Paper text:
GCs exert their effects by binding to the GC receptor (GR), a ubiquitously expressed nuclear receptor that drives both the activation and repression of its target genes. GR is normally sequestered in the cytoplasm and binding of GCs to its ligand-binding domain causes GR to translocate to the nucleus, where its DNA-binding domain (DBD) binds canonical activating GC response elements, or (+)GREs, which are pseudo-palindromic hexameric sequences containing two AGAACA (or similar) half-sites separated by 3 bp. Here we demonstrate that GR binds directly to κBREs and propose that direct GR–DNA interaction at these genomic loci are an important mechanism to repress the expression of pro-inflammatory genes. Taken together, our results demonstrate that GR binds a conserved, cryptic sequence within a subset of κBREs to repress pro-inflammatory transcription.
Residue numbers in the entry:
A (entry chain B): 419 to 490
B (entry chain A): 418 to 490
Amino acid sequence: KLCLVCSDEASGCHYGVLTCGSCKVFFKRAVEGQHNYLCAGRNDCIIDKIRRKNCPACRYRKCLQAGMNLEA
Amino acid sequence: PKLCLVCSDEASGCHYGVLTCGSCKVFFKRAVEGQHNYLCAGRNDCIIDKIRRKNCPACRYRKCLQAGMNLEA
DNA sequence: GCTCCGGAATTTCCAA
DNA sequence: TTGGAAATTCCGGAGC
Ligand SMILES: [Zn+2]
Ligand SMILES: [Zn+2]
Ligand SMILES: [Zn+2]
Ligand SMILES: [Zn+2]
């Protein structure tokens, strides 16, 4: 039932991956925002429920290598 | 010149005992009266600057305390 | 007249 | 939206 990104509960499978609501209003506007997103860490930041908003960079990263894309 | 000891932006003036910008001033003020409960998603060495400073409240708050910031000064 | 600082009130911002 | 946190702006009072 877990979002494969933030490990909150999934609202369904969107963009080819099972994840949550916020994680699926997030990928989302990073792509056609085509955003910068610099990490203040090592690029290995932990992504979970209340930390997910700390590092958009690592969050966006983890989105991609879970396979999220705009296509179907 | 004139540059903040915390978020590394240009300093409004000495605030709470530490030369700092205005952003960190009201950040620190808000942190001490409220809760600290912030978590770091990194190793607690996170880099703080104008773009990065909003990423990790935890590390930013730590730097303020490290800098010597205190409410009565 | 000014400088300096705390700080409240206001606006900007964005996540959920 | 609905509400919380960020940040710029502005005012009160101690000084000088
Ligand atoms: Zn998620
Ligand atoms: Zn990161
Ligand atoms: Zn600062
Ligand atoms: Zn951190």
